[model samples]
Target: KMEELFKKHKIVAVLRANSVEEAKKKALAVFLGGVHLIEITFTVPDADTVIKELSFLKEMGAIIGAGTVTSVEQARKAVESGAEFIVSPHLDEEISQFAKEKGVFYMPGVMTPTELVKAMKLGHTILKLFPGEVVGPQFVKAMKGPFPNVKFVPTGGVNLDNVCEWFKAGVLAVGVGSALVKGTPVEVAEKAKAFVEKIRGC
Candidate 1:
């Protein structure tokens, strides 16, 4: 299951590239670095094509998913392209309906109590804390106080140096973007390894 997969990897390496080649390269690098969970954000042009190409990595147990997806159409495209999961920058009613129909896990982004309540009322517990840089780990720590059952995957400001800090704030997993995809594929792979080690406290 996706939740079990998240528990197993405890890291979601998010990547947004200018080109398809770069997207594929970084994805493989992160996979080679031992993180099976990968999220390719829709910020890239023709994002679903990237999802389609990388979906083949399921053979190697890679969990390829879509990120920054905000509309039903975008979610549909990613699903058609075989995305294992769908992550939206914000909660959209139609997106959730489509996700339910397709039997795909959808993580809606939330930052405040009002947003969190809306997600929960709609039967969403696992959520994305968008722009984690602004909220910081302490914000997550604070949110956890009332909604301890909710699982969060915060994207932004998560790096090798402070991954453990987020985990300590009670995140089920951390969604890392720019920091993990900086430089070339080799560098990304190495960084992925470092993140994996840090997450596992190895």
Candidate 2:
């Protein structure tokens, strides 16, 4: 459903909104920032509404989806509301099954080769290598030796300072939070635009 846009964008902005208005405004800011892929995490209370609103943008060819999905029911709900893909903090077979059945992209969090194998066995080629600070780019480089076909998106503790290191180490992309756009800022859109451009080179 995402096609090659997600792969090209490389950066998926995680928007954790505490309120509906905040979510909408943040989506607008990020869209203006030129990074199309977005994930509205379930950690946000009104995530469904956020997904529904952003889905309209997806229809217009924007990359929008959901994250922090931990169950089949949540995955179903997101797909029903028009999420193009689902991401989890950790892998869940039930959710993976549902995503596979529905023909949507599924990316589950993995921290080790064993977990990566488990997720890949379930038909997930792209995985979220979470808390990248703990594993670092060296871990990714090592993983690539044996599983070069596998791809990863590293999140948590990924900033401009170390993003190029991750890219050079063979990551498909990296997820960034806080460093790009503050939850509350007067120049949120402009600041996000600059951040996106800075990371694009990496």
Candidate 3:
């Protein structure tokens, strides 16, 4: 279902909010930037509430998903709140399995070859190579040489400068945090659009 989103918008803004109200605003800002997929990290309070609100905004052309999820319970809550997908910073077999059983996409983060293979064995095609900056695109290129069938979404430390390199290394998409949102001090409305443009060039 989200296949179109992955193909259409190379950038999916990660909106980590403090409240449901703030999440709604953040989601709106990204939507205005023409991105169709929005991820609400579990670090935010009342994340389920935010997911529910965003899920109902189908007319906005935005698909709401969850990130930073660590457990099966959290995955259940996110799914119940209408999350279209589940993203975690680490691989959790139970969580990924449960989400798949529920017909929801699960993206587990993996930094090493073993972890990536393990997540893939669990039937998760969408993997997040988190802390991508720390590991670098060279690692992804190396991974592609051996596991070329796997698709990746690199998160953390991904910016305009090197995002293209990550893609060239065979990443399906890249995720950014501070570079895209610039922290809570600044609104990501304008920056989000520019980010979309930058990723599109990749």
Candidate 4:
């Protein structure tokens, strides 16, 4: 089921909204543009409330997850609020274990070989390569030499222009943030559509 979600929506819209209402509006706009994956970061006001509200989108076939999750308590709250997955900017064994116990997907960020191996040892095969632009796509390709079994979801610094390169370098998916939500709802939708079309071509 998780694999299907990633395969169908290769682009996860990383939304950091200023308000709950704006989150809802932007989410719907992106969904309308054919992006079914949404990540609502905890930084937003009443983020859990927004997650609960957006939970209804699951019925419409949207896969929703919580992003920027840094603690165990936050992970619990996110899951309770209907987040199907938990995404963190850094690897935490406690959070990963909790997510495993709850049978939810956990994607923790990692940059170094040490962090990547530790996360993989925790039974997480799919990981998040954050600040991906800094690491660059070549880093991903290089890591594959030792951790060939791991699949990556490159998050930070992923934009329309470099997304294809990430995929070409063997990233499973890309998480797009400001590059996706920088504009008005209509503009965001247009960008979303462009991304979807580009991803499809790739």
lDDT of 3 by residue, 96-146 (tens): 668767888777898888888787777776788887878887887886778
Model 4 residue 184 distance off true place after TM-score fit, in angstroms: 1.6
> Candidate 4 regions off by >4 Å?
none
- Model 3: per-residue Cα lDDT at residue 38: 82
Lowest summed lDDT over 10 consecutive residues: which window, candidate 2?
179-188
lDDT, candidate 1, 1-202, per-residue tens: 8888887779887888998799999989989999888888999889899988886799988888898887778887999999889998888999998899889999999988899999999998888998798877888788767888998888888776788888877888898888888898899898888888888883
> What would the per-residue lDDT of candidate 4 be over residues 34-110, giving only the tens digit for each residue?
89889999988888899898878999989888999988889989999999889999999899889889998888898
Evaluate all candidate structures by whole-model CA lDDT and list the values in order.
Answer: 0.86, 0.78, 0.77, 0.87
Model 3 ranges with Cα > 4 A deviation = 183-187
Models, CA RMSD each: 1.2, 1.7, 1.9, 1.1
TM-score of each: 0.96, 0.92, 0.92, 0.96
lDDT of 2: 0.78
Better of 1 and 2 by TM-score: 1
Clash list (residue pairs), candidate 4: none
Off by over 4 Å in 1: none
Per-residue lDDT over 1-202 for candidate 2, one digit per residue giving the tens place of the 0 to 100 score: 3536656777788877677778878878877777678888887776877888776787655777888888777887888888878889898988887777888888889998899889878778878889788988788898777898887889788775786777888777677766665755446677767667777766
